[PDB]
Amino acid sequence: MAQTTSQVVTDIGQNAKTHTSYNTFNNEQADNMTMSLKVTFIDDPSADKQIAVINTTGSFMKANPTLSDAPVDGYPIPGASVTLRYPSQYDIAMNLQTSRFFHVAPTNAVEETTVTSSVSYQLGGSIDASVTPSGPSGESGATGQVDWSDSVSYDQTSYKTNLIDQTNKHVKWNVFFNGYNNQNWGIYTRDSYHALYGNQLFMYSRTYPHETDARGNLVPMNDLPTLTNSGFSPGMIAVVISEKDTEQSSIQVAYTKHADDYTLRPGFTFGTGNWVGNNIKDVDQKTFNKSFVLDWKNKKLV
């Protein structure tokens, strides 16, 4: 179609569809994850090989606990120890054990900016008068300003969906986390340090905290993004092509969840009147992999 040619023609799908859509779904309840996949085989005899479109769907939960509960520790210990396992990285892999992973979705696109360069200049003039013991003034101003502005459609932290290293064998994605505006103040990230508060991305009372248990001094789950409390739903699409000479293959479909443990403690300097929040990188990881046979003669999948 890029050469004033008919659309949906250069595109495979003319007198050859057979549309052999298959589905297989599975759950790993230990980390309460739900895999989904959607394959459709297209075998056009005009081509040399048989094409198969793979669509992964479903969702994968954050499953956000607070696993270290030391409420205040008034007298013996220098203070509380409350942690929260906030997930950060969500790597998804499809490792072919055959034939190449031809297409990969989504990809990288443009980022939208609006940089502004403003200049303004002014003039002034005034008069003041008096009669009885009092002095008059005068004024005649002149001003000139230059303003520069920036603005980008950054998707808060949400979870940015980058396309990490591909292969015709191993496809990967690393949908990371960036930062959030806790209680309308922001934007704070995983790096932002304060001399007397630490990281406040997960702080609840943003002015001065009453001396309460840190198990209930966290900003609530739903006071944070929709994904961070619920889970992301993949829509990643991949395609596999194999020759009519070639036959059955054995795919792997891995889904992972990196997790971070943002912690609140007075034990990490001060924290008595205020309350300090801290973050230690890459704490929890869990993996669940699964293999699948791609039949190519009857164009099923088990």
Add this chain to the structure above:
Amino acid sequence: MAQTTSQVVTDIGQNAKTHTSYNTFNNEQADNMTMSLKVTFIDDPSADKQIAVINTTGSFMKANPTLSDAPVDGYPIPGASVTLRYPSQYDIAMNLQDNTSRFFHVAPTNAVEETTVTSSVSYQLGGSIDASVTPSGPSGESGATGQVDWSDSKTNLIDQTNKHVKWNVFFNGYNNWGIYTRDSYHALYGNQLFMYSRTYPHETDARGNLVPDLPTLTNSGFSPGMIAVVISEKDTEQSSIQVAYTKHADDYTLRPGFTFGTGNWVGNNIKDVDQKTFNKSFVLDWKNKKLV
């Protein structure tokens, strides 16, 4: 399409077993809710299994009463408790019995949220001259400044499975003054989320000091459009899904918890006060491809 493929090929619906649309509707009047469902069976011979799409519509009423008319009977602590049951969460769950089949693709989900952080910087210069009387007397001025300006500008999915899928319809904020949330704290007012009149209007009962001017949903109701999909083997015959409908509610009251000078009425609201549940099961016949 995104795979340089022809449009509408990867998706099923070709020489497939019709669009067996079924329908079932009922009303639970106690909380006056009206459930609706519309299933469509697709039996693709090219596929290995049989597809069925479940679409949930209809409507759920809020039925928001004012159950505490204290200011009207005995004025306890001048101008007392008027309560309002503002519902907050609306969980809808579909829990298939843990022996039969698997749940599959579900709509809606959570989505990326986009923000726009701005960084503006401006710098200027100044200059002026003054005149006076009493023979001879000018002044002068020469300014220089620089500014930096920064500007900026919920349907949650609680744990799902191939067996139990659930959603959490949260609440975000309200305004003509600034945003206030389900937790917004005032040192001398508490939560003022639905406050109308500050400092008392006429020492009136709080039955008529509430802001009426608020969203369409509360009172009227939102209509769900949630979609789910189930696929089952061609050999197997039946299944027993559950469909739970819930309404968690909060009870914001306007009472003299605190009162100062001109009756500065105080408002407080506490989460998840009232709950109501309404479940019903449905038979997933797979050989005759219906559902009651």
Add this chain to the structure above:
Amino acid sequence: TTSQVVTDIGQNAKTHTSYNTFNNEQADNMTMSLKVTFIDDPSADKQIAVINTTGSFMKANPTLSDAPVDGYPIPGASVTLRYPSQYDIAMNLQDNTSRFFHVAPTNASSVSYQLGGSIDASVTPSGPSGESGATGQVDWSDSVSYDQTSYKTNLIDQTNKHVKWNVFFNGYNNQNWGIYTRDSYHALYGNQLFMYSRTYTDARGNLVPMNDLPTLTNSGFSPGMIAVVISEKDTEQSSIQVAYTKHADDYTLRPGFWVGNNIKDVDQKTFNKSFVLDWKNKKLVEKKGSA
């Protein structure tokens, strides 16, 4: 992962029926309209029928009290105008459960800091001055939209029996919204939602004109609300009701105690009618038979 027009019912179906019935209620100058279409999918369990309500209902906004206009208190401004506020339209299935069902429509930080520097001079003095400023701002703003004129097709409670809609009124910018946010207040003006002149003369011509206000408020809204009823092949008849209502308020002005006042629903009139949904021959409250 589904195709287009595949989850939708509409395959190898049977005669789409598409009947019509229109009538006028002239007392309140009302025009009722209905759009029924029966669709009988053999693949389904039951028979589907889509009802589309159309036509219109006029506001016909008068000023019905123009006489106190001479002298002595309560005089040349005791002018009332019956401005309607709420427009509920109801479809109450005969309490017997013909299974109502699906329905349409439905319901749904800045910071700036600066720095300064200056010098002050004179003519024959002894010393100059200097200045070094520092500023920092924090700005928070909001803005709402959607249905400002508030003709919002809210969906008040539906059932398997009675479906309803409430297109109410919130507020508008009369003249130039110099005041009145919406059924609001003023300590010396009252409600200014319907004020033309703040100082001004007969009060019949000191009102902001009918056409100086939104298109609907002077003319009337046309419903397009559609509902669908599905019933078993066992059933052969149905009995919906179709109510049309017009709640109205009587906004009145005053010279002084220029005071204006909004008054909650005072006078209303309704026009409802039921319809027979014959399912074995697809007739309505009209026409006859055949064979």
Add this chain to the structure above:
Amino acid sequence: IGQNAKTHTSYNTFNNEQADNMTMSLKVTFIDDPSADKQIAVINTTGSFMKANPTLSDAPVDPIPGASVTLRYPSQYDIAMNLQDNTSRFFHVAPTNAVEETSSVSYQLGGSIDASGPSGESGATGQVDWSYDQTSYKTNLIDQTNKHVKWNVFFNGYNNQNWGIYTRDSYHALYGNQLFMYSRTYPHETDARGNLVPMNDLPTLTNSGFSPGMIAVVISEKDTEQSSIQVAYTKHADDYTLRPGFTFGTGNWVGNNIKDVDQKTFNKSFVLDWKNKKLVEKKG
């Protein structure tokens, strides 16, 4: 409707009223669905109607040939379809009326030292800050029935050379309405025919004319045989006038308008002739 019904009997009938240079147009297509109960017919009104904006002053009457100059600027354009109160029932009319679709607070702090009266400071400040058809041709659906349907495309106000905003109702402080004024005090004693903003210096429609696209539909039983619909077209006019001598002071020009001065209507009926649907007056 209109599914596997065929017919699609598009007819056309046009006439011109040259006195006010109006051009009526109609576009009917009859659809007879056997699945339906009755016979459907959609009528589409098109064509145009001119504004014909004159300045008909200083006309055979002439010390003041440059005084009291009027312009008959139209305001309302009502289009009506009045079936006689004994026929087949009017139904759906297009278009309809639709819904038409900020608060900021900022607080700051200050503090300064003036060195190198003024030798100290400490500030605190707080601020609170709060799709118009400017070419006002609002297309309202004014009172109708299943017998007489009407429309009121009225006019509201304009942005005179981006300077305003003035309406036909709101009046300049001590000038009346200046919406069609070009120069307020520069031409001190000039002829009043030429102190207006040109016809083209204001919206596109105001000097030329609107083309209707109003569509209506009539349905009648298959038992019934004939109908006698009427379709009226009207043209209201306003009288904005310019004169000098207001309160003197550099020739303040008086701008005034006494509303609803001239009116014109152009109606004609048509026989639908269901028998053959000829929809062109006449008879059977």
Add this chain to the structure above:
Amino acid sequence: TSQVVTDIGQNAKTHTSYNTFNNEQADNMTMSLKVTFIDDPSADKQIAVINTTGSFMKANPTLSDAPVDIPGASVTLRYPSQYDIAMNLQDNTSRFFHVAPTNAVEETSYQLGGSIDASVTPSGPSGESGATGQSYKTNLIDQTNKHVKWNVFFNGYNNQNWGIYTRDSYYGNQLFMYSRTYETDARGNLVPMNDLPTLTNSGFSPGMIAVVISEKDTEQSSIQVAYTKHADDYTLRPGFGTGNWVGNNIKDVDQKTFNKSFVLDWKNKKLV
């Protein structure tokens, strides 16, 4: 309902697209036409849609050039203003109706203060407490059944990034002046043509569409198709005391016409 159907297109017979193009080189104008005759049996009459395309040049000269002459230099430029297009059917034949495109409508705080000041021994502290409270419009003159007209006026343009000047903006007019300060030939003190709007230096490309219907009994018709160009003569003078450059223009100076007739045969739906 049947409201958005109005289906003439359906089973439209003969699809008789015709084409004819011509040029009038004197004013470098190019007329184009696209006719299609449709004889729909469902209709009463036979319909024919005419689509006008092509282009028309501005051809902007400066034909009065006295280079350096209180009395100015008198260099004028004939910048055209109005572009009238007329279609004059003889006042006895069938009807004309419908016109595309059409005209459209146009879519268009309280604060507080506070401060405190400190100073030295006999000076005194201060305070503060503030409070505050705050063009190528395409017009469609009336259609008729025979004689249709178009005018499509223009008002003004914004000279290089500054201000706005119209066909009535009174330096005098600087609409076509480049530098006002102060003295070459006045033929070359104008802002360059490509530094001015795209239309002013090129031309307009008509896209006007019209439709004609005629009764099945009657035969042939004799339409006119006029193309016109009203022109204005903007004039430049370099002082007409400081030496500033003054610009003047008077409306409706030059007009030129190029008309052509066409036979509407109706029994075979050919247009020559």
Add this chain to the structure above:
Amino acid sequence: TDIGQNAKTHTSYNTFNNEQADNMTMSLKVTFIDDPSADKQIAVINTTGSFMKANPTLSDAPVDGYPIPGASVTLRYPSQYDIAMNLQDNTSRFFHVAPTSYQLGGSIDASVTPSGPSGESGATYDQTSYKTNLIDQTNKHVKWNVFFNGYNNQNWGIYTRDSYHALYGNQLFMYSRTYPHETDARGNLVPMNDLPTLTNSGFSPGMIAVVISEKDTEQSSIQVAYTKHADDYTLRPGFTFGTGNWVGNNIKDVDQKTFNKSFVLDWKNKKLVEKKGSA
């Protein structure tokens, strides 16, 4: 109202050639449609391909050396581009062508000494790359000038072929002034890719025209001209006034590279003229 109903044919032809002197690539896409319902036969011509800018600084190559006359850097940056289509003054007809606030105040102050108050009461563009114009067409010669207007160099702007300054001249392609690296200005120009996508790479024409001739008529030798035009901005610390003020000025049409090839339209003989005979 559009030709394409029971019209068959669909005889898409193509002819491509390269002009290596300016490294230009002309492309053509003709499709003949002979609708029997019409009177004449329709043929749609679509010109595609691209033409490189090839923007040099003709004062280049390693310098160091022993130069007396300062630096003297020039750049031949093209401005206008044209795609004329001139059918021979005796052929068929060309029928259609594409593209075508107030406030108030009040305040109070308090002080020391007898009677010490004080009061206050206040009361108050498709720039940056080119333009796609259509100079007047005819039924014989259709021709357009895709010229260039202005750019915002290094976040400062906007500057244009007319942009003036009292002490720098035109700075449209300036990187930095006053003392810029005070080296050769060959590496003091704003980089070519710091400028529009077109200016450093080349524009791809997409102009569409259509030719129709009567079923009676024969032959229509057309001609497809392709041209370019460059501006010559000069910048040097050898014609200026020393004291920094490194000024630079720009002039008009200086370089041109026209390319032509009268493809015999063959309004019935298809095979557009190509390598004439065997190659």
Add this chain to the structure above:
Amino acid sequence: VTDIGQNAKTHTSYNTFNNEQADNMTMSLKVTFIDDPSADKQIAVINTTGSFMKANPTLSDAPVDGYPIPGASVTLRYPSQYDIAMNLQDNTSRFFHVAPTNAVEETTVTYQLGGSIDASVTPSGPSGESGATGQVDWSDSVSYDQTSYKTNLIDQTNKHVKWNVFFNGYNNQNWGIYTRDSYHALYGNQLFMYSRTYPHETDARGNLVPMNDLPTLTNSGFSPGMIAVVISEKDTEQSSIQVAYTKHADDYTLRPGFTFGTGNWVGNNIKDVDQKTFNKSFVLDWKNKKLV
């Protein structure tokens, strides 16, 4: 109908992919042959897909993190240019339509009076002020493709077609805009800086702005979707295209160079240091319309 390819029998889409693991590049290509009998020649559309990784190392990361002698000598090899070329052998030729293309970059370029009175007591009266000002603001803005992905089409031919997806600039920690030539008097280039001043002791390998704190492309890989088409006469028999894939790289480095300062980290960068290329030829058979 203006578009060719309708009922165009041959749609013989083939695919051929390979990976070069040393610099971890993976080439992919997608051709479909269409043989239109109405035309004179046979058309073949090639779609380049797959991806190419940045694989961004810090290869000079301070060996043992030595403070005064090694000091601040951590570099980062950030690639800049990504040229993709298709060079037909000089006997076949006949390149035609190429996607994507270039386009116009879009830009958007864009008085008061006073009066007041002051009053006091003591031998004194009122004061006055009457201001008058006027300002003229001038702004501009485009939709910057700032991060990277400026997708230019350098000169095409019937022999060699090329693309230069360059890199332009970035907003380092939301401040900008900074480019490869952005100089500061005391810091050099800050395009790749994390911390504007560290108190003397951090490793400079972990003093970089994090990888994901930089554009999506910069840390992962660009995925081409670039399409080209080759047409050849029915007389001709075969052709030999080249498909080169390249990655020019820059070495952004913090190096003593000019000794050191008061703990402030200087950043510098020199262009186009290391590059890697991966080319391969392919036979475009035209009789059986395959391609190895």
